[PDB]
Amino acid sequence: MRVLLAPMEGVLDSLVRELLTEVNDYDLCITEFVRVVDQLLPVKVFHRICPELQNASRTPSGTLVRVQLLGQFPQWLAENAARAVELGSWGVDLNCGAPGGGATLLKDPELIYQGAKAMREAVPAHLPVSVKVRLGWDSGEKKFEIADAVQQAGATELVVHGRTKEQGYRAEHIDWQAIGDIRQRLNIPVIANGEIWDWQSAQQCMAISGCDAVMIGRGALNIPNLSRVVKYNEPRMPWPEVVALLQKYTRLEKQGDTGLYHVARIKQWLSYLRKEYDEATELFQHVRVLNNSPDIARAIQAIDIEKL
RNA sequence: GCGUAGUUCAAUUGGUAGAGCACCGGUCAAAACCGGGGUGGGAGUUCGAGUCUCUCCGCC
Ligand SMILES: Cc1cc2nc3c(=O)[nH]c(=O)nc-3n(C[C@H](O)[C@H](O)[C@H](O)COP(=O)(O)O)c2cc1C
Ligand SMILES: [Mg+2]
């Protein structure tokens, strides 16, 4: 059984990847997307998005990390893929599910075939080239054309987020059966994604999709130890350990911090935690109106985890 | 439909805007190399709006 930490732009940066991988057993992390247009991006963009590149593409605890590209033009996906791996990335991921690029490639699977193929030919054969897709644009009727384009490009594996672009993040529309049909169609491995929140949902997803590998995104913020909950049926991280994890986060420094990073990300993480832990509602209200990093850092750090 | 740095572009359910060219500075007029990166106006909601909403303006 494999459990991958999902790419999450504005959420799962290197700091959060560091904190989660310490207390999880994630088999792999994907970075926030590197946006490609018509230009070989400079080295500093890759190091900013993926500081793990300077530790052999690993988090401090040792979990591997993979750079994701979002783009359309094959030549420039290829050249930025070659740079990513040359800098250390363990393979490269192609974004085909972000609402010229992202989910718009799902309208013409030829673009996916052509982009992924150029990336495959640019990256050393044994480093994986993966693709992350949604089921389609507005319906899922072209889902197999999308899947076929990934395989015939020569990609190593396919992550399928089991919704279309229009369905967004609405829970009713999750389609693990569609992922199963893609798995049965393809020779390359298929990784299921969407609405895995705990052990039960991960079991139902693996049972329905037939996938041994899963990827979890928002649930990994809701339950900070979700990989261990999913792999080993362990209980959710107790609330006092969650607060300790947030205290640790306030002590980490973000490079490029324009002043309000922790004001943003403590409140954002608490917003996720608020959907799982009752105690996160009171703590969000305690820090709600704090409008600068020193204050929110002071507020979080002052909590005695021993008395919670 | 779009409007974002001088300009060409980038920016996942709201979390605090970064690349190329141009430009300025440095090493030794220019070159080369190296370093440096403000959301059309206003309003609404929110602790927080490029992002959701209204209004006026501008371009298909
Ligand atoms: C805030 C947020 C940011 C995301 N950013 C990315 C991204 O940069 N690249 C990507 O391929 N998917 C991205 N996704 C999609 C997730 O990887 C994932 O497919 C989706 O959240 C469904 O999984 P889940 O139900 O476990 O959250 C993002 C999702 C969210 C909610
Ligand atoms: Mg966001």
XYZ file of C-alpha atoms (C1' of nucleotides) and ligand atoms in Angstrom:
400
model
C 0.000 0.000 0.000
C 1.312 3.423 -1.100
C 0.177 6.796 0.290
C 1.373 9.956 -1.539
C 1.078 13.494 -0.136
C -0.763 15.601 -2.737
C 0.468 18.786 -4.398
C -1.336 21.726 -2.734
C -0.532 25.225 -3.986
C -0.465 27.771 -1.138
C -0.701 25.039 1.533
C 1.846 22.217 1.302
C 5.102 24.133 0.896
C 8.504 22.882 2.128
C 7.784 23.894 5.759
C 4.515 21.937 5.947
C 6.105 19.054 3.975
C 8.866 19.028 6.619
C 6.370 18.986 9.535
C 4.071 16.327 8.072
C 6.806 13.919 6.860
C 8.384 13.871 10.350
C 5.108 12.500 11.822
C 3.912 10.443 8.793
C 4.842 7.583 6.481
C 4.271 9.234 3.113
C 5.891 7.342 0.249
C 6.221 10.560 -1.808
C 5.387 14.297 -1.808
C 4.543 16.434 -4.848
C 5.507 20.131 -4.854
C 3.339 23.145 -5.535
C 3.243 23.549 -9.350
C 6.100 25.253 -11.196
C 4.272 27.305 -13.846
C 5.830 26.954 -17.317
C 5.001 29.068 -20.390
C 7.625 29.583 -23.175
C 10.799 29.998 -21.156
C 13.454 27.940 -19.355
C 12.818 29.093 -15.775
C 15.853 30.014 -13.656
C 17.373 27.737 -11.006
C 16.164 29.920 -8.086
C 12.475 29.279 -8.942
C 13.063 25.518 -8.522
C 14.948 25.978 -5.224
C 12.210 28.336 -3.918
C 9.373 25.905 -4.684
C 11.493 22.840 -3.785
C 14.241 23.537 -1.157
C 14.418 19.727 -0.816
C 16.379 19.720 -4.125
C 19.481 20.715 -2.083
C 19.011 17.659 0.174
C 18.848 15.171 -2.734
C 15.102 15.840 -3.214
C 14.200 14.812 0.349
C 12.528 16.399 3.353
C 14.733 16.468 6.489
C 13.075 13.225 7.727
C 13.931 11.482 4.410
C 10.687 11.391 2.383
C 11.246 11.901 -1.363
C 9.763 14.948 -3.128
C 8.860 15.440 -6.826
C 8.636 18.746 -8.749
C 5.346 19.295 -10.611
C 5.165 21.369 -13.792
C 2.046 23.154 -15.034
C 2.294 24.073 -18.749
C 1.280 23.380 -22.366
C 4.227 23.857 -24.756
C 6.148 20.521 -25.116
C 9.592 22.087 -25.717
C 9.377 24.131 -22.503
C 7.859 21.363 -20.379
C 10.815 19.244 -21.598
C 13.517 21.829 -20.822
C 12.072 22.677 -17.387
C 11.693 18.929 -16.677
C 15.383 18.363 -17.530
C 16.374 21.248 -15.214
C 14.201 19.910 -12.357
C 15.851 16.460 -12.433
C 19.350 17.901 -13.002
C 18.858 19.907 -9.789
C 17.875 16.681 -7.936
C 14.096 16.073 -8.294
C 13.121 12.394 -8.151
C 11.263 12.461 -11.435
C 8.775 15.139 -12.504
C 4.946 15.436 -12.416
C 2.733 17.062 -15.102
C -0.344 19.029 -13.965
C -3.455 18.295 -16.067
C -6.129 19.092 -13.405
C -5.760 22.730 -12.237
C -8.946 24.799 -12.763
C -2.954 27.686 -21.521
C -2.468 24.645 -19.260
C -3.721 22.712 -16.227
C -7.222 21.283 -16.722
C -7.567 22.935 -20.194
C -5.336 20.142 -21.584
C -8.216 17.733 -20.777
C -10.118 19.278 -23.742
C -7.454 18.099 -26.240
C -5.652 14.897 -25.026
C -3.171 15.356 -27.934
C -1.606 18.162 -25.837
C -1.197 15.759 -22.885
C 0.359 13.104 -25.154
C 2.735 15.679 -26.682
C 3.735 17.375 -23.396
C 4.226 14.175 -21.409
C 6.179 12.564 -24.300
C 8.611 15.525 -24.474
C 9.092 15.313 -20.702
C 9.712 11.539 -20.916
C 12.384 12.001 -23.604
C 14.071 14.822 -21.607
C 14.232 13.030 -18.229
C 16.649 10.083 -17.597
C 14.806 6.820 -18.297
C 14.709 5.454 -14.715
C 13.465 8.676 -13.083
C 9.624 8.612 -13.090
C 7.557 10.975 -15.249
C 4.055 11.101 -13.757
C 0.843 12.882 -14.817
C -1.937 14.109 -12.521
C -5.367 14.419 -14.133
C -8.987 15.152 -13.492
C -11.624 12.953 -15.199
C -12.479 15.686 -17.715
C -13.520 19.276 -18.338
C -17.353 19.356 -17.897
C -18.260 15.646 -18.250
C -16.165 12.464 -17.892
C -16.892 11.159 -21.419
C -13.302 11.663 -22.683
C -11.615 10.128 -19.585
C -10.096 7.192 -21.499
C -8.666 9.442 -24.256
C -6.918 11.317 -21.407
C -5.684 8.078 -19.800
C -4.501 6.652 -23.164
C -2.549 9.841 -23.944
C -0.613 9.447 -20.665
C 0.277 5.788 -21.329
C 1.253 6.188 -24.993
C 3.398 9.224 -24.123
C 5.447 6.716 -22.064
C 4.647 8.153 -18.627
C 5.607 6.099 -15.586
C 2.296 6.464 -13.681
C -1.045 8.330 -13.616
C -2.710 10.061 -10.649
C -6.465 10.422 -11.197
C -8.409 12.959 -9.159
C -11.888 11.382 -9.480
C -13.843 14.489 -10.551
C -14.133 16.780 -13.564
C -13.047 20.442 -13.517
C -16.651 21.732 -13.133
C -17.259 19.410 -10.141
C -14.403 21.182 -8.292
C -14.261 19.908 -4.698
C -17.940 18.922 -4.156
C -18.016 15.604 -2.252
C -21.111 14.153 -3.966
C -19.342 13.982 -7.372
C -16.331 11.830 -6.345
C -16.055 8.878 -8.765
C -13.723 6.146 -7.514
C -15.346 3.687 -9.964
C -14.122 5.837 -12.884
C -10.593 5.543 -11.470
C -11.045 1.760 -11.355
C -11.995 1.670 -15.043
C -8.873 3.717 -15.883
C -6.746 1.299 -13.792
C -8.199 -1.719 -15.639
C -7.569 -0.014 -19.006
C -3.922 0.918 -18.371
C -0.715 -1.099 -18.083
C 1.038 1.663 -16.064
C 0.133 2.009 -12.352
C -2.840 4.216 -11.417
C -3.024 6.187 -8.150
C -6.489 7.076 -6.802
C -7.233 10.533 -5.409
C -10.127 12.438 -3.807
C -12.225 12.319 -0.609
C -9.917 10.074 1.442
C -10.392 11.422 4.993
C -9.628 8.434 7.271
C -9.134 4.638 7.349
C -12.744 3.832 6.322
C -12.798 6.086 3.234
C -9.330 4.893 2.148
C -10.539 1.258 2.392
C -13.702 1.991 0.352
C -11.605 3.876 -2.255
C -9.055 1.059 -2.618
C -11.888 -1.504 -2.716
C -13.836 0.392 -5.417
C -10.912 1.669 -7.528
C -8.789 -1.492 -7.018
C -5.774 0.800 -6.459
C -3.028 -0.104 -3.967
C -1.640 3.462 -4.265
C -3.621 6.496 -3.084
C -2.904 10.241 -2.854
C -4.362 12.404 -0.063
C -4.551 16.222 -0.041
C -6.979 18.161 2.177
C -7.379 15.281 4.674
C -3.634 15.521 5.415
C -4.319 19.007 6.865
C -7.574 17.903 8.571
C -5.736 14.994 10.232
C -1.970 15.769 10.478
C -1.081 12.035 10.806
C -3.493 10.767 8.103
C -0.974 8.417 6.396
C -0.594 6.453 9.661
C -4.385 6.505 10.159
C -4.769 5.159 6.608
C -1.866 2.642 6.510
C -2.091 1.279 10.069
C -5.599 2.178 11.369
C -4.039 4.314 14.139
C -6.108 7.003 15.867
C -6.047 10.626 14.665
C -3.271 12.791 16.113
C -4.475 13.906 19.556
C -5.338 17.627 19.729
C -2.455 18.471 22.127
C 0.060 17.023 19.616
C -1.662 19.051 16.844
C -1.121 22.279 18.829
C 2.534 21.272 19.412
C 2.853 20.784 15.626
C 1.484 24.324 15.070
C 3.879 25.679 17.729
C 6.710 24.024 15.761
C 5.371 25.701 12.579
C 5.549 29.182 14.178
C 9.265 28.533 14.920
C 10.039 27.693 11.254
C 11.094 30.613 9.027
C 9.825 31.043 5.483
C 12.334 32.300 2.915
C 10.795 35.150 0.895
C 8.415 35.966 3.795
C 6.851 39.345 2.950
C 5.649 39.741 6.570
C 2.384 37.828 7.117
C 3.242 34.179 6.272
C 2.270 32.733 9.699
C -0.809 34.979 9.937
C -1.896 33.349 6.644
C -0.871 29.725 7.226
C -1.751 29.171 10.912
C -5.256 30.504 10.168
C -5.450 28.456 6.954
C -4.365 25.222 8.679
C -6.743 25.914 11.618
C -9.543 26.285 9.011
C -8.815 22.696 7.875
C -8.452 21.395 11.465
C -11.791 23.089 12.335
C -13.604 20.412 10.246
C -12.167 17.497 12.298
C -11.303 18.737 15.813
C -13.932 20.581 17.898
C -11.103 22.286 19.837
C -9.804 23.999 16.650
C -12.899 26.285 16.556
C -12.040 27.915 19.901
C -8.345 28.311 18.903
C -9.253 29.867 15.532
C -11.432 32.374 17.418
C -8.540 33.093 19.827
C -6.217 34.061 16.922
C -8.890 35.382 14.488
C -8.234 39.134 14.705
C -4.415 38.960 15.057
C -2.956 40.840 12.053
C 0.856 40.376 12.304
C 3.301 37.461 12.552
C 4.896 38.330 15.932
C 1.473 38.367 17.649
C 0.111 35.112 16.194
C 3.461 33.358 16.845
C 3.378 34.581 20.472
C -0.275 33.476 20.827
C 0.281 29.911 19.568
C 3.579 29.402 21.454
C 2.093 30.536 24.805
C -0.342 27.546 24.969
C 0.694 24.895 27.520
C 0.177 21.542 25.744
C 0.405 19.839 29.178
C -2.861 21.553 30.325
C -4.939 20.883 27.134
C -14.361 37.201 -22.069
C -10.320 40.077 -20.359
C -7.682 44.547 -17.528
C -1.625 42.604 -12.778
C 5.769 45.641 -12.136
C 8.073 50.203 -17.689
C 6.504 46.109 -21.020
C 5.251 40.438 -22.245
C 3.320 37.119 -19.211
C 2.638 34.031 -14.263
C -0.231 33.266 -9.718
C -6.193 25.988 -7.139
C -12.106 25.912 -3.367
C -9.881 33.667 -0.266
C -4.200 33.324 3.269
C -1.008 38.448 1.603
C 1.668 38.803 -6.146
C 7.131 36.339 -9.370
C 9.446 35.075 -14.118
C 11.597 36.937 -19.288
C 12.844 41.408 -21.721
C 13.817 46.552 -20.613
C 16.197 49.210 -16.745
C 19.749 50.434 -12.544
C 24.265 48.943 -9.890
C 28.903 45.937 -9.589
C 33.415 42.975 -11.596
C 36.778 44.405 -16.076
C 31.563 53.653 -23.199
C 29.610 48.932 -25.133
C 29.873 43.573 -24.463
C 30.010 39.434 -21.304
C 29.286 37.622 -16.461
C 27.132 38.759 -11.511
C 23.367 41.216 -8.358
C 18.818 44.035 -7.812
C 11.369 42.070 -9.099
C 3.188 46.662 -8.375
C -3.411 43.882 -9.185
C -7.679 50.129 -14.172
C -10.293 53.779 -10.024
C -13.667 53.260 -5.882
C -16.979 50.348 -2.683
C -19.003 45.645 -0.234
C -18.239 40.908 2.779
C -14.112 38.888 5.801
C -9.225 38.878 10.734
C -7.446 38.654 5.469
C -9.596 39.787 -1.595
C -5.442 39.356 -7.971
C -9.054 35.483 -6.229
C -16.064 36.237 -4.182
C -19.482 40.611 -5.019
C -21.224 45.604 -6.636
C -20.144 50.372 -9.211
C -17.573 53.487 -12.768
C -13.908 53.273 -16.521
C -10.849 50.767 -20.597
C -9.879 46.645 -24.584
C -11.833 42.145 -27.914
C -5.735 24.281 -1.862
C -5.500 23.245 -2.930
C -4.397 23.369 -3.768
C -4.130 22.428 -4.765
N -2.991 22.593 -5.543
C -2.718 21.680 -6.433
C -1.500 21.830 -7.225
O -0.667 22.722 -7.108
N -1.300 20.824 -8.150
C -2.125 19.734 -8.354
O -1.820 18.920 -9.227
N -3.260 19.584 -7.593
C -3.543 20.512 -6.679
N -4.666 20.353 -5.913
C -5.500 19.147 -6.084
C -5.077 18.082 -5.076
O -3.776 17.588 -5.395
C -6.059 16.908 -5.040
O -6.147 16.350 -6.346
C -7.467 17.261 -4.559
O -7.394 18.091 -3.399
C -8.332 16.052 -4.275
O -7.752 15.301 -3.191
P -8.349 15.402 -1.711
O -9.794 15.039 -1.700
O -7.489 14.463 -0.863
O -8.109 16.840 -1.238
C -4.993 21.327 -4.920
C -6.106 21.209 -4.084
C -6.375 22.154 -3.100
C -7.625 22.016 -2.267
Mg -5.555 29.094 -1.840
